[PDB]
Design a protein around this motif. Structure first.
Motif, PDB file in Angstrom:
ATOM      1  N   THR A   1      14.454   3.135   6.112  1.00  0.00           N
ATOM      2  CA  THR A   1      14.576   1.759   5.665  1.00  0.00           C
ATOM      3  C   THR A   1      13.238   1.028   5.615  1.00  0.00           C
ATOM      4  O   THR A   1      12.923   0.375   4.613  1.00  0.00           O
ATOM      5  N   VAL A   2      12.448   1.132   6.682  1.00  0.00           N
ATOM      6  CA  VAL A   2      11.142   0.460   6.697  1.00  0.00           C
ATOM      7  C   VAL A   2      10.088   1.127   5.796  1.00  0.00           C
ATOM      8  O   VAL A   2       9.254   0.440   5.216  1.00  0.00           O
ATOM      9  N   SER A   3      10.120   2.448   5.674  1.00  0.00           N
ATOM     10  CA  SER A   3       9.190   3.139   4.782  1.00  0.00           C
ATOM     11  C   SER A   3       9.456   2.753   3.320  1.00  0.00           C
ATOM     12  O   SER A   3       8.535   2.587   2.536  1.00  0.00           O
ATOM     13  N   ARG A   4      10.726   2.590   2.975  1.00  0.00           N
ATOM     14  CA  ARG A   4      11.104   2.199   1.628  1.00  0.00           C
ATOM     15  C   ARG A   4      10.509   0.838   1.249  1.00  0.00           C
ATOM     16  O   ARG A   4       9.845   0.712   0.224  1.00  0.00           O
ATOM     17  N   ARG A   5      10.749  -0.177   2.069  1.00  0.00           N
ATOM     18  CA  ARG A   5      10.228  -1.519   1.801  1.00  0.00           C
ATOM     19  C   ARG A   5       8.698  -1.589   1.770  1.00  0.00           C
ATOM     20  O   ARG A   5       8.116  -2.342   0.995  1.00  0.00           O
ATOM     21  N   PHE A   6       8.061  -0.808   2.630  1.00  0.00           N
ATOM     22  CA  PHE A   6       6.619  -0.778   2.722  1.00  0.00           C
ATOM     23  C   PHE A   6       6.036  -0.199   1.427  1.00  0.00           C
ATOM     24  O   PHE A   6       5.082  -0.744   0.878  1.00  0.00           O
ATOM     25  N   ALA A   7       6.627   0.885   0.925  1.00  0.00           N
ATOM     26  CA  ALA A   7       6.188   1.469  -0.343  1.00  0.00           C
ATOM     27  C   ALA A   7       6.420   0.523  -1.522  1.00  0.00           C
ATOM     28  O   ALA A   7       5.583   0.444  -2.414  1.00  0.00           O
ATOM     29  N   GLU A   8       7.535  -0.206  -1.513  1.00  0.00           N
ATOM     30  CA  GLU A   8       7.838  -1.203  -2.552  1.00  0.00           C
ATOM     31  C   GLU A   8       6.830  -2.362  -2.585  1.00  0.00           C
ATOM     32  O   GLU A   8       6.689  -3.054  -3.607  1.00  0.00           O
ATOM     33  N   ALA A   9       6.141  -2.598  -1.479  1.00  0.00           N
ATOM     34  CA  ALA A   9       5.197  -3.716  -1.436  1.00  0.00           C
ATOM     35  C   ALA A   9       3.803  -3.345  -1.961  1.00  0.00           C
ATOM     36  O   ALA A   9       2.967  -4.222  -2.131  1.00  0.00           O
ATOM     37  N   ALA A  10       3.552  -2.058  -2.213  1.00  0.00           N
ATOM     38  CA  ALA A  10       2.209  -1.615  -2.636  1.00  0.00           C
ATOM     39  C   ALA A  10       1.843  -1.970  -4.079  1.00  0.00           C
ATOM     40  O   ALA A  10       2.707  -2.139  -4.936  1.00  0.00           O
ATOM     41  N   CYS A  11       0.542  -2.080  -4.338  1.00  0.00           N
ATOM     42  CA  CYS A  11       0.055  -2.342  -5.688  1.00  0.00           C
ATOM     43  C   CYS A  11      -1.322  -1.728  -5.885  1.00  0.00           C
ATOM     44  O   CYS A  11      -1.963  -1.271  -4.919  1.00  0.00           O
ATOM     45  N   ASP A  12      -1.773  -1.728  -7.140  1.00  0.00           N
ATOM     46  CA  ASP A  12      -3.126  -1.287  -7.501  1.00  0.00           C
ATOM     47  C   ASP A  12      -3.394   0.179  -7.126  1.00  0.00           C
ATOM     48  O   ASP A  12      -2.750   1.079  -7.651  1.00  0.00           O
ATOM     49  N   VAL A  13      -4.345   0.415  -6.228  1.00  0.00           N
ATOM     50  CA  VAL A  13      -4.628   1.765  -5.748  1.00  0.00           C
ATOM     51  C   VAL A  13      -4.031   1.986  -4.356  1.00  0.00           C
ATOM     52  O   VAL A  13      -4.346   1.259  -3.421  1.00  0.00           O
ATOM     53  N   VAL A  14      -3.185   3.005  -4.227  1.00  0.00           N
ATOM     54  CA  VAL A  14      -2.554   3.339  -2.958  1.00  0.00           C
ATOM     55  C   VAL A  14      -3.125   4.673  -2.512  1.00  0.00           C
ATOM     56  O   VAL A  14      -3.342   5.560  -3.335  1.00  0.00           O
TER      57      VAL A  14
ATOM     58  N   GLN B   1       7.153  -9.505   6.618  1.00  0.00           N
ATOM     59  CA  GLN B   1       5.714  -9.700   6.802  1.00  0.00           C
ATOM     60  C   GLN B   1       4.959  -9.415   5.504  1.00  0.00           C
ATOM     61  O   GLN B   1       5.258  -8.445   4.810  1.00  0.00           O
ATOM     62  N   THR B   2       3.980 -10.251   5.179  1.00  0.00           N
ATOM     63  CA  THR B   2       3.136 -10.010   4.001  1.00  0.00           C
ATOM     64  C   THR B   2       1.928  -9.144   4.352  1.00  0.00           C
ATOM     65  O   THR B   2       1.135  -9.495   5.229  1.00  0.00           O
ATOM     66  N   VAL B   3       1.800  -8.012   3.669  1.00  0.00           N
ATOM     67  CA  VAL B   3       0.636  -7.137   3.809  1.00  0.00           C
ATOM     68  C   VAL B   3      -0.205  -7.177   2.527  1.00  0.00           C
ATOM     69  O   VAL B   3       0.340  -7.343   1.445  1.00  0.00           O
ATOM     70  N   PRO B   4      -1.537  -7.030   2.645  1.00  0.00           N
ATOM     71  CA  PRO B   4      -2.390  -7.023   1.448  1.00  0.00           C
ATOM     72  C   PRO B   4      -1.999  -5.842   0.579  1.00  0.00           C
ATOM     73  O   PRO B   4      -2.219  -4.702   0.997  1.00  0.00           O
ATOM     74  N   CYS B   5      -1.422  -6.106  -0.595  1.00  0.00           N
ATOM     75  CA  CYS B   5      -0.698  -5.061  -1.330  1.00  0.00           C
ATOM     76  C   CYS B   5      -1.624  -3.951  -1.835  1.00  0.00           C
ATOM     77  O   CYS B   5      -1.194  -2.811  -2.014  1.00  0.00           O
ATOM     78  N   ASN B   6      -2.906  -4.273  -2.020  1.00  0.00           N
ATOM     79  CA  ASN B   6      -3.870  -3.290  -2.500  1.00  0.00           C
ATOM     80  C   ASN B   6      -4.616  -2.509  -1.425  1.00  0.00           C
ATOM     81  O   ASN B   6      -5.548  -1.772  -1.733  1.00  0.00           O
ATOM     82  N   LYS B   7      -4.225  -2.660  -0.169  1.00  0.00           N
ATOM     83  CA  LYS B   7      -4.960  -1.992   0.912  1.00  0.00           C
ATOM     84  C   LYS B   7      -4.041  -1.085   1.763  1.00  0.00           C
ATOM     85  O   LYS B   7      -4.257  -0.884   2.966  1.00  0.00           O
ATOM     86  N   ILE B   8      -3.014  -0.540   1.133  1.00  0.00           N
ATOM     87  CA  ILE B   8      -2.042   0.279   1.857  1.00  0.00           C
ATOM     88  C   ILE B   8      -2.482   1.726   2.006  1.00  0.00           C
ATOM     89  O   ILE B   8      -2.944   2.350   1.039  1.00  0.00           O
ATOM     90  N   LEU B   9      -2.407   2.224   3.247  1.00  0.00           N
ATOM     91  CA  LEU B   9      -2.626   3.639   3.538  1.00  0.00           C
ATOM     92  C   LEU B   9      -1.337   4.342   3.992  1.00  0.00           C
ATOM     93  O   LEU B   9      -0.777   4.014   5.040  1.00  0.00           O
ATOM     94  N   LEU B  10      -0.869   5.299   3.197  1.00  0.00           N
ATOM     95  CA  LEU B  10       0.252   6.158   3.586  1.00  0.00           C
ATOM     96  C   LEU B  10      -0.296   7.433   4.216  1.00  0.00           C
ATOM     97  O   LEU B  10      -1.482   7.743   4.063  1.00  0.00           O
ATOM     98  N   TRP B  11       0.552   8.176   4.926  1.00  0.00           N
ATOM     99  CA  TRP B  11       0.141   9.467   5.490  1.00  0.00           C
ATOM    100  C   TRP B  11       1.328  10.399   5.733  1.00  0.00           C
ATOM    101  O   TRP B  11       2.457   9.965   5.787  1.00  0.00           O
ATOM    102  N   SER B  12       1.061  11.691   5.833  1.00  0.00           N
ATOM    103  CA  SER B  12       2.110  12.654   6.147  1.00  0.00           C
ATOM    104  C   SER B  12       1.599  13.682   7.166  1.00  0.00           C
ATOM    105  O   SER B  12       0.618  14.384   6.912  1.00  0.00           O
TER     106      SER B  12
END
Ligand SMILES: N=c1c2ncn3c2ncn1[C@@H]1C[C@H](COP(=O)(O)OP(=O)(O)OC[C@H]2O[C@@H]3[C@H](O)[C@@H]2O)[C@@H](O)[C@H]1O
Length: 247
Positions: free
Chosen positions: A147-160, A71-82
């Motif tokens: 596995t999914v967290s890894r790919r999701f982080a690899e897709a990020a760009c700009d400001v995360v 799936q393509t996600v907007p690479c500059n609009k990613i929100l991570l959390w812990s």
């Protein structure tokens, strides 16, 4: 019977039916996934852990599912959390200012569920599943998320961005999935800045575990930025109505 094989809770009841329905609902909402065949997605998910020893699961087991869930996600609009999931989800729900992993098809399917199988049998174990700490880390649930967290982080760009819980003993925890998987899989060629929101008083951006995070990401050649969110109740209100005296 009065004792179980593993230390963790068993597979969520109606697991098969639940995953399948979540797939249907997701694919009816999001138009770019409106073609996905949910039966085959289920088949792919099943194949990753059925008849396999629940302490010997690998990332390769999950590749058929990953392929189907691309799936393509907007690479500059990613929100991570812990450790702060509720706030992160209420936030993205307001006007889709950002995307968390659970806003993806794959993250959506598995959110809040538990699952495992058995070696040399095609049965789902509704009784118990391996505990990450007491039993084994290579179980079907822990391996799926890595596995999914890894790919999701690899897709990020700009400001995360990342939301962190300022009430915990370790605001940044090197042993969490964010600290051990996502920070090391952001791509320095593409990511300009990691900005942390510390959810609460003190200046928690001076906390020792936050200085550790800053040092780790700076040494990757990525800029670090941090902000305190003192009143998460007021903040969410400002997101819904930036037209507010207080904001
Ligand atoms: N969304 C999500 C998730 N949901 C369940 N688990 C998980 N791990 C990671 N993520 C993503 C990864 C990061 C960080 O999530 P974190 O809170 O730091 O993970 P932890 O160490 O506290 O999880 C313990 C246990 O729960 C699951 C893990 O597999 C673990 O086995 C988020 O941005 C999210 O995208």
């Amino acid at each position: 019977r009065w004792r179980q094989t593993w230390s963790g809770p068993g597979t969520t009841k109606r697991f098969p039916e639940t995953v399948l329905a979540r797939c249907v609902k997701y694919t009816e909402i999001h138009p770019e996934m409106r073609h996905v065949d949910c039966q085959s997605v289920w088949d792919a998910f099943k194949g990753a852990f059925i008849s396999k020893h629940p302490c010997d699961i690998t990332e390769e087991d999950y590749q058929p599912l990953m392929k189907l869930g691309t799936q393509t996600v907007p690479c500059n609009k990613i929100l991570l959390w812990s450790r702060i999931k509720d706030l992160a989800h209420q936030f993205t729900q307001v006007q889709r200012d950002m995307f968390t992993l659970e806003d993806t098809l794959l993250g959506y399917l598995a959110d809040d569920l538990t699952w495992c199988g058995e070696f040399d049998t095609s049965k789902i174990n509704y009784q118990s599943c391996p505990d990450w700490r007491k039993d084994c880390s290579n179980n079907p649930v822990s391996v799926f998320w890595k596995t999914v967290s890894r790919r999701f982080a690899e897709a990020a760009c700009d400001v995360v961005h990342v939301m962190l819980d300022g009430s915990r003993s370790k605001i940044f925890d090197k042993d969490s999935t964010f600290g051990s998987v996502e920070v090391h899989n952001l791509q320095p060629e593409k990511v300009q800045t990691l900005e942390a929101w510390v959810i609460h008083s003190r200046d928690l951006c001076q906390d020792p575990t936050i200085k550790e995070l800053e040092s780790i990401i700076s040494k990757r050649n990525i800029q670090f930025s941090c902000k305190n969110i003192y009143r998460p109740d007021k903040f969410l209100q400002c997101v819904k109505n930036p037209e507010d005296s207080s904001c």
